[PDB]
Amino acid sequence: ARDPKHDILFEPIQIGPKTLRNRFYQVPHCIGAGSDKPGFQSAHRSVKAEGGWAALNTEYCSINPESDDTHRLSARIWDEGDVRNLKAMTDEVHKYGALAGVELWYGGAHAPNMESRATPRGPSQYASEFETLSYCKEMDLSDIAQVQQFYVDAAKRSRDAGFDIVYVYGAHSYLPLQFLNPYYNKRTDKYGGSLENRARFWLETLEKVKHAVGSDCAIATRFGVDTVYGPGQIEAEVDGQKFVEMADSLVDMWDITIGDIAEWGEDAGPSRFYQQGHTIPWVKLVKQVSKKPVLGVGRYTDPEKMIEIVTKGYADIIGCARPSIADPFLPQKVEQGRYDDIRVCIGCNVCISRWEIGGPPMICTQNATAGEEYRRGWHPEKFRQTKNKDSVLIVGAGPSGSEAARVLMESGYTVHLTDTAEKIGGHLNQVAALPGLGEWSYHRDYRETQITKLLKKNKESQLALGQKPMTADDVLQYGADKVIIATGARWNTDGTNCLTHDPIPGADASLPDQLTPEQVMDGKKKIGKRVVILNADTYFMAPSLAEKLATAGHEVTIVSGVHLANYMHFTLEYPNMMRRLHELHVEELGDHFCSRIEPGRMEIYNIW
């Protein structure tokens, strides 16, 4: 049964001329779709439609070739080809009876424009603190009118296109915010200086947009009320509130975030440094001045936490991004009170990793059909059930084999899942024990929960943990019709790496002063005052271990033969990871590989 305290969550709300069936709102977010993958775009939002989110939005959407995000992919609404391709999605969000927003974007010099080659315009001449090679032209007053018409244009075409919601996207430090914010805005004419100068651009733009489709589409804006940079950028209690105040009559809805573009990690909080609701303290402050509907993300997956922020009059609606990728059905699960069936977004940001690399499609660590709904036609909550009696052995019940069984059993098969470990999760179990990653558990947690549930529903099907490792004889004699081996990988023992592809002579971690991240992680094997992490890995392993050991008070040097933490640049984790390794006085020697290990001693070399 639906706990009735959550009823609150299924109460409509008025947003201008538009009505949200319920409180569950998918804010704009990229997916690797844009206008370019109209299949994938439609399907992936329409399942969330069918899943019962109220309104679904395209990712940030370009109003003109002089804001082109290539190599990244954004969406576009430049021409009638675009209005075609985006309509596919609106019809499709429509047939399930929620709303379609589209997020009107121009980002000035943050748009490198590598496809369109055109020149980007801004309040003042600068060069992006993100695409550092990409400079804007200073708009004169005629540049102010032509770009504003841009949005108008783009707002018209948004209605032809069938959007129920349009935004003036003013977050992550794109055009309207660049005007507002003195960091960017060095103008001394009437568009600059005074708070009502700064916000004229946006204030204007909003109005123009209203005038344009105001009576058929709710105009929302997203706004980045604090930059979390402090003095010198927007502060919520300085410019933030006030701006809310100056806009409020224009907006049908606020859609709130904090951060800039260069480290939007602060909007999209890593679970490695942020919990749920993180944003709230700065979210809150917006209701205290707005008289309009306000939503504001914050990795809200828990309906308890959801009801808190509404019944405490901190939001009106629930803004989600990631959590809607994890579980397109999270609402109808909450509506249906099916609390245990909910797939909890772990905050791993791999999903932002792909888009942030420039080109590939989003993928997701809980939701393996994410990206897969058009092109493979996998639905996250419907499965082809088998038309035989066939059975499957699965060896190992880690991410891989556990999904293996989850899906199969959901498919109706007869499955025996076995692993030598005592619990479901393969190496996730240590991974989640690394400092910060405690919310990455969730990924076995959900599996353990559903296999358990699946077993009562298949009677032959079987879970067996604590077993004797299987042998190939056990396996051939097991009697499964089919077998999935899912037995894992281990850290390399022997200094084998991506540079040499051969072992480092004198590397071997049966020796007393030599560790793997299993041995560090098991916590048994004993660890010397002075530590050196020899790193060939661009992802989290290295830094993290570094954190661990430092916090346990060893003296720490990472020897890195690759760019450390490179992946992390892309999950939005990197800033706070570095600051963190600084804070714990962790020594980094880059561009440095190693040619032989000896007791107490290693030979290292610059790679240039």
């Binding site: 004699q477 009697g479 499964a480």
Partner: protein, 233 residues
């Protein structure tokens, strides 16, 4: 030599069951499985059987056509035969009536050891084994967390797991009825090729008349309490 293990098929409700009459829960909310404790039983016995060179393990169950399901799972988990004692008039026998019905199977079977679980997962009576022990007139101990028994001893040595975790050793005259407690061993799991070969085994069906009972002996009419109400609290 022969160890007889008394097993039960329990019920587990779904969310959100509903009461039925007000005397039970509705039957559609129910799901039947081998009581959890019995998995620890069956093993201890397979433990013994494999510790030697010749021991029949035999599981016995009282109840309806469903139970089969469980006794087969016992076959696969190790048992040598599986017996089901039934008659419709057995409806609602309570934990002491079960003792008695078991006992009469237990005599025909004449084992050297009788194992019961410590309590059921469903009604948690924590009576059925000791009841079989009174009626049999055997030496009993309840709550067994360790067994040393070799086949055809006159004598075994157990350990009761007391409240809070402190153990107590007991020396007990055999043949004895013992209720086995959780954590006693690590009950095996059935290969598919195992579960497959236990399909092909017979469940022996035993009738009240086969065991010198009658309708007038069993079912709630004879029981030791009587159901007044069941209510979700």
């Amino acid at each position: 030599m022969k160890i007889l293990v008394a097993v039960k098929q329990t019920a587990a409700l779904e969310e959100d069951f509903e009461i039925r009459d007000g005397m039970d829960v509705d039957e559609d909310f129910m799901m039947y499985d081998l009581n959890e404790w019995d998995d620890f039983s069956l093993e201890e016995a397979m433990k013994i059987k494999e510790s030697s060179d010749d021991v029949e393990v035999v599981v016995v169950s009282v109840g309806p056509d469903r139970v089969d399901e469980s006794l087969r799972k016992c076959l696969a988990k190790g048992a040598d035969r599986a017996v089901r004692v039934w008659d419709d008039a057995a409806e609602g026998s309570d934990a002491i009536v079960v003792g008695r019905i078991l006992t009469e199977v237990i005599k025909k079977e004449a084992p050297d050891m009788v194992f019961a679980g410590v309590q059921s997962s469903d009604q948690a009576y924590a009576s059925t084994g000791i009841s079989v022990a009174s009626y049999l007139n055997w030496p009993h101990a309840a709550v067994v967390a360790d067994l040393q028994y070799k086949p055809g001893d006159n004598k075994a040595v157990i350990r009761r797991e007391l409240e809070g975790g402190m153990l107590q050793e007991v020396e007990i005259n055999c043949p004895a009825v013992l209720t086995i407690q959780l954590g006693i061993n690590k009950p095996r799991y059935a290969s598919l090729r195992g579960i497959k070969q236990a399909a092909t085994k017979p469940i022996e069906e035993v009738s009240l008349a086969d065991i010198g009972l009658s309708a007038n002996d069993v079912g709630a009419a004879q029981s030791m309490s009587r159901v007044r109400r069941m209510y979700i609290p």
